[PDB]
Design a protein around this nucleic acid. Sequence first.
RNA 1: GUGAUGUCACGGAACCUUUGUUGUCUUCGACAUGGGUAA
RNA 2: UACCCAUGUCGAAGACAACAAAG
Length: 1473
Amino acid sequence: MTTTMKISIEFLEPFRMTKWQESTRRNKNNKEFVRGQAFARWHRNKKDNTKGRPYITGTLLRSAVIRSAENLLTLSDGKISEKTCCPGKFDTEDKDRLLQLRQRSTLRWTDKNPCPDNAETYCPFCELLGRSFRIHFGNLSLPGKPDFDGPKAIGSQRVLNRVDFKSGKAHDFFKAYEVDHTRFPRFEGEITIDNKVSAEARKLLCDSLKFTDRLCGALCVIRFDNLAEKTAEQIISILDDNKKTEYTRLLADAIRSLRRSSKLVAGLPKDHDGKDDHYLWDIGVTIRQILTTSADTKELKNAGKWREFCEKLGEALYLKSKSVLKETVVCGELVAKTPFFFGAIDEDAKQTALQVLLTPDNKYRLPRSAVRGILRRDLQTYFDSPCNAELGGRPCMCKTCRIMRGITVMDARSEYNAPPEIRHRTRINPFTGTVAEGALFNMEVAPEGIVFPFQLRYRGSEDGLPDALKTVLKWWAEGQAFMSGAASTGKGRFRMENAKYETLDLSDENQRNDYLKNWGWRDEKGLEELKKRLNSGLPEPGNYRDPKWHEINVSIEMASPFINGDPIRAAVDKRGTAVVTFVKYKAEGEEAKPVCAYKAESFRGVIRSAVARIHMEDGVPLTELTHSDCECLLCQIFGSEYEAGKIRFEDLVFESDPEPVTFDHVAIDRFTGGAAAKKKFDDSPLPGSPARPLMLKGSFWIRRDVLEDEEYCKALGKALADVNNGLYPLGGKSAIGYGQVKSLGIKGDDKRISRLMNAVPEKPKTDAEVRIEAEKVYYPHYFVEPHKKVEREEKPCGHQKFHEGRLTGKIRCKLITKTPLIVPDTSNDDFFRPYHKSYAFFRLHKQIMIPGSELRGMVSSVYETVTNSCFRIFDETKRLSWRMDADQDFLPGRVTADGKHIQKFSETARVPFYDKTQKHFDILDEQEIAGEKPVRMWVKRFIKRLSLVDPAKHWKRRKEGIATFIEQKNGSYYFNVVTNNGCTSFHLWHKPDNFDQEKLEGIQNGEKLDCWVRDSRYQKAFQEIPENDPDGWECKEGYLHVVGPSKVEFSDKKGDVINNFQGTLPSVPNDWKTIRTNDFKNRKRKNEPVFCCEDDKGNYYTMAKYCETFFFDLKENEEYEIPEKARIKYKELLRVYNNNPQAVPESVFQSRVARENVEKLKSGDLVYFKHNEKYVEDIVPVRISRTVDDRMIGKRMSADLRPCHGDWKGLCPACRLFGTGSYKGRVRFGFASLENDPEWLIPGKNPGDPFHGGPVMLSLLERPRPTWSIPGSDNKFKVPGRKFYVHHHAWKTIKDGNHPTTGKAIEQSPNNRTVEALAGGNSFSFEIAFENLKEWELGLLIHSLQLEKGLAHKLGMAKSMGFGSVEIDVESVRLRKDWKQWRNGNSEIPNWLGKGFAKLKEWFRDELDFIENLKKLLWFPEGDQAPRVCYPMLRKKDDPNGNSGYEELKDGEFKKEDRQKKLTTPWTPWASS
RNA sequence: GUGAUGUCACGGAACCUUUGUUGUCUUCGACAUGGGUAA
RNA sequence: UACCCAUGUCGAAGACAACAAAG
Ligand SMILES: [Zn+2]
Ligand SMILES: [Zn+2]
Ligand SMILES: [Zn+2]
Ligand SMILES: [Zn+2]
């Protein structure tokens, strides 16, 4: 006789579920199992499989109901209905049977004895306990009994740590499964109640069910009545096929960044010319096309679906890369004033190192655990007493724990669901100034401005909230709620807003019953009614305590460009650039606004370095200290791995919205003087200049106790003063003038910290002498042959501190132009044009200036020559090659079926193919033409010519014989000649012998006559014996070498041979096998057959080759193997053939190697080869072809002169001063600013604006040719030296349209430049910042700058044609004696120069000849002295002046034997004239 | 799928430390092609 | 198997090297 009451539990928060465990561990000795006794449980349908279902025990529900009953009986003085309850019986004989025992105190409401063990009737409380089944609680299950694969199908495990209060660092953690109430809100069950129980027991059960507010860690209401995989495979296959796997990770991070929107697919960058040949997105179908067809797929039209697709694809690519009781309700919103980071790692998401916590539907989550932890920390801070409570046991009774036992906080989420942003973070090596090994990672960051609903309920005996809670909530109201991790980088600062508080008296019977009836107004509907009763504001704490953190505002003025780089954003950005500045997102509504900001991590690192460089502990600078378990200044101010820091830097944002500009850079090879291979690049920094300085303003929070301390204030003041003196540039690429701090100023410190922030020798006369003759013509560039000794002895000083005896400061110099100067703005190529590229001068904010990178390059090139050093930029991997001449050792051969052997054909013959004397093309198969199948062709090696008259009147070896005349036709005689006493009889046709045929004109058929026969070399083969000469043909089997009609001459202007062509010029045929000879270059003798044609693309073609080859007499016994060196040389030859700008525009006239893009040597190939012993030296595909050098170009140079590899071989003085990849340089080159209004070379069109200038056209600036200075493969030829262009006044001649060498004209072209030049007399002032420079280093830098009276520099564009001669005068030197004191060093300059020259004497005692050579290359022409300098022309027939061209110079003056000495002796003429 | 006269698990901040940075003159002249002739 | 040269056009580089998380 029982009745069933059905119950339902609805969860308002994600609830906690336990990990499944077998019955062997379900005991009292397992910590993990007993920890989850208050959580939901997971069942197994079978023990082996994880397929199961979540359930809630009836025991947990019963315990919660009993606790609520205790509370209700306490609030009603033990009275339920008209009966009084007993104090309750909680006393068990067998303590062991109880899995757990109560460790909280039991509420007490009466002094009576508990009910008797055996009694006729029991109080309602005892009936509810179960002493009077009577009331049985059944397990609650999901409705419908659904099955799930496993716990991870319904929930995700999360880590919850425990943080020490004093240190701020965690020391332990535990995990639990969180199941979202959105997916699984309701659990249903039943309670079986016996009919004999009293009505008061049922009333108490109902009241306790309605009073139970939490269960399984969540607030609850109890009521009783393929494509991504395929895309990844395709992308990986495309990368594998094209050998572009090194771009995989960059493609994994970029594609992942596409998860924000599919619109980014159309916004992907293109090539530099606007075409779809981007080096990343057009690798292939292409990757861009794959992403395009994935974007508009019907499946991925939803934003969430596209985000999931992008995340899965990025992950796949990354893996490929490897009594009195009151309740106060406070409702408001927590708003993020900074980015925040609640850490939670997904094990299946390995692409991001640091991740934020999200809901299953990708909403940002403000967890309840973090809010409780922050509340406890803030209360402990308020009380100034840490809670020394250990886990487990009876509850702690401190002031904090008492407050926390009445506190309930709702877990919160946000409507905003955009994916988090990814930030790059690194750690710098203090000694090298570069990044440390392995210190590169990325962090997920949630945007600022996200709003979370916030509800806090406090249940306690006080009238309202305690004073501690009031003060903590007022701290949070002032925006000092630091909730999340990564606080030192200014993350996780919230402000509580729209706060309302209301107290409900649960002691009142009416209020208690109202609370019970409405379930405490904790559900979504109940909160709506409750919030109407809430009153705005917060209680004012009587004993209010000030917040522990104080805000200090920083304002930085930088008169220079700035960049905080982000390469992935650039890889995705619409405008193709190598790197772009960092941009963050802030949340507005459901949208994200991107803004440019200086990362808080970078500013924190710079400030920390500034503090550490000037301070040292116990004789050791703070940087060198291990910073483990120490009390040093750096750990006190900034924290360490042991404890949290007392300072927190926020992101500094730039005022206004400065849009970034694009600066191009190219590395200049020190040998060739031109662009180094692959070293062309872009940068997109924020533009800054003295005209419009960047203003970077932000805040950082410092703890009050530090701001009170005098020593910390003094340390921060000295560091910020050194930053204020420009000692610490912000951002990257400061070596080229970026991010120079003009001024720093802090506010809000009450002046505690800011109180600390507050004749040059004449150029020496030169000794250099250069004699110039007006007749002589000199070369544009010469080479300084360097001294063999490059000093690697010194070790580079670290950037960790300033050193005694070393000089730090700034050099202000005046750079003067002595000739026109050209520095182009290459972002736009149409400044002087309405194609022919035309560049404006370099201007920043419409101010003419020289970027620091060009000045740095020029000064570094001079410095590498003053002190002998390595060639810092040099393409060592280049392989030189030359063309053969018509002058033997190459022999025919066929590559065997193995592929590692080539046999040797004994003989070759010329088989006419493209003339009208045979039908070989018709009577040969494709396989025979290709050389696959052997063919039988008659060959003749000697033809016979005869004279009727005995040799006279003009052979040297003739055999006389009897000619029997057969016939005469076509004007040519025909007779069978029998000679060698009848041994050899052959039929031959004969041309009329001049002055001889007339004597014997009489034609007798069957005659006998006297003749003399000679043999001539006629090495030709035909498949069928020709009818004219059916004698002396030997049938031989061999292979046909057919490379096509390759020997061709293509001219824009009509050549002599094609001009005399009679008829109409035919079209170029598509099939190269149909090409037939149409004319003869020597028509008189019917030789040199030629095929002439004309086309629009290539103008006139003249193909003079009519014979293919026939390889016969193969030597199968003889073979030669192919070394890998020969194979790589042949591959280089093939790539040079295929990558040929000057190739003929018709592929029919190209060889089979070039017209069919032969990428490798394969089996069956017929080639020429030269060999040594049993291995092949060189292989060529045609008769006259390319010769490839065996060694790299860098081998032609001494190893001491090669670029330093770091990993410290050591460092040269110039590499030491300017830095390498592993060592940061100690010099920073700022932008030179033009002092006055510019005197220009050419005034522009409009006289209204005088600052702008007019166009001028340079001649063709062509690629430097290393093969000229290096005449060939001989080891005698070396790298002559470092190229330095001489000073000359060809700019005057080329100011008109006069070519430098010729002067005929300079017409526009699609391959030349137009520029505006700063005429001579322009004055710039610039500053070079240096740190830790020796005396001789400063002296030699000054010498490199000033040079001597009579010298100059060359800077900018078109140095060969007289442009860019500039001079530098050192104006002033400021030296950093101390952080507070600076003194001038103009009196110390002579000592600097003397010590530098003494160091030069030490290094090179009397071998300073290079200096003089450099000096002669730096010598500037005196008055009444104008040398003439120009490159030669191709040939003398192209030069009106009559000077010898390159073809006439390679033999003669600049012959291979003496070209190097001519080019290594400065100012050496190449034309006497 | 929990036992039952005793479960503070709202008893526990995934927390602390790290500079997207180092190096690079928007520069610049001789090369490309393969045969033809031996009346 | 031994000589002989003939033709006059043409852009190149477009990022590279390193770190890809540790304590
Ligand atoms: Zn009782
Ligand atoms: Zn406590
Ligand atoms: Zn320390
Ligand atoms: Zn070096």
